[PDB]
Amino acid sequence: LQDAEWYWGDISREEVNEKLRDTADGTFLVRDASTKMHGDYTLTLRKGGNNKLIKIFHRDGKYGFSDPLTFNSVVELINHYRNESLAQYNPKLDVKLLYPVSKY
């Protein structure tokens, strides 16, 4: 994760939103979590118009999203979901975030 793509580099609702205010029906990027000085960031996705916020569970430098904090990498995780689909979050259904946003 030297820079990642979906993630721009931590920003704010102004940027995130301004970009997710007019996009496909399922976007996803990162939101700077400067409200703890101890956490990493916050995943945010556009659900057709309602930006859904999601917190990231970090500890010392790794990441928590599915496993007991061990993969220590988002690119590794997000990758496994980018090609598949987050069907573990909300049961009875599934979501697919194959529409990231950036400036690459």
Side-chain angles (χ1 to χ4, degrees):
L1 205 148
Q2 319 198 294
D3 232 86
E5 326 190 293
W6 347 274
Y7 299 176
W8 306 2
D10 102 67
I11 56 271
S12 56
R13 338 197 202 75
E14 312 189 345
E15 271 275 55
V16 160
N17 195 325
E18 284 162 47
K19 221 296 196 298
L20 266 63
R21 70 104 186 203
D22 174 18
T23 19
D25 190 90
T27 329
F28 66 115
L29 34 57
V30 129
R31 211 303 201 124
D32 197 22
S34 79
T35 177
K36 233 178 173 48
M37 304 201 181
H38 239 106
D40 265 34
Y41 308 127
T42 258
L43 253 68
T44 264
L45 10 168
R46 185 63 147 185
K47 213 142 162 177
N50 206 134
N51 35 18
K52 193 232 188 84
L53 206 94
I54 282 143
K55 274 168 133 179
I56 270 279
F57 344 130
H58 146 257
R59 232 180 147 151
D60 247 288
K62 12 176 188 222
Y63 283 101
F65 231 72
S66 100
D67 245 44
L69 269 146
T70 337
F71 39 102
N72 75 84
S73 359
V74 211
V75 205
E76 174 137 62
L77 177 124
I78 235 312
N79 160 25
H80 236 93
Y81 274 118
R82 239 177 77 187
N83 243 48
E84 298 205 296
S85 264
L86 303 153
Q88 254 162 135
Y89 261 69
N90 251 271
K92 301 203 301 83
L93 59 119
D94 30 289
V95 225
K96 354 183 211 188
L97 75 199
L98 282 130
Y99 319 83
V101 271
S102 208
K103 304 293 204 61
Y104 246 75

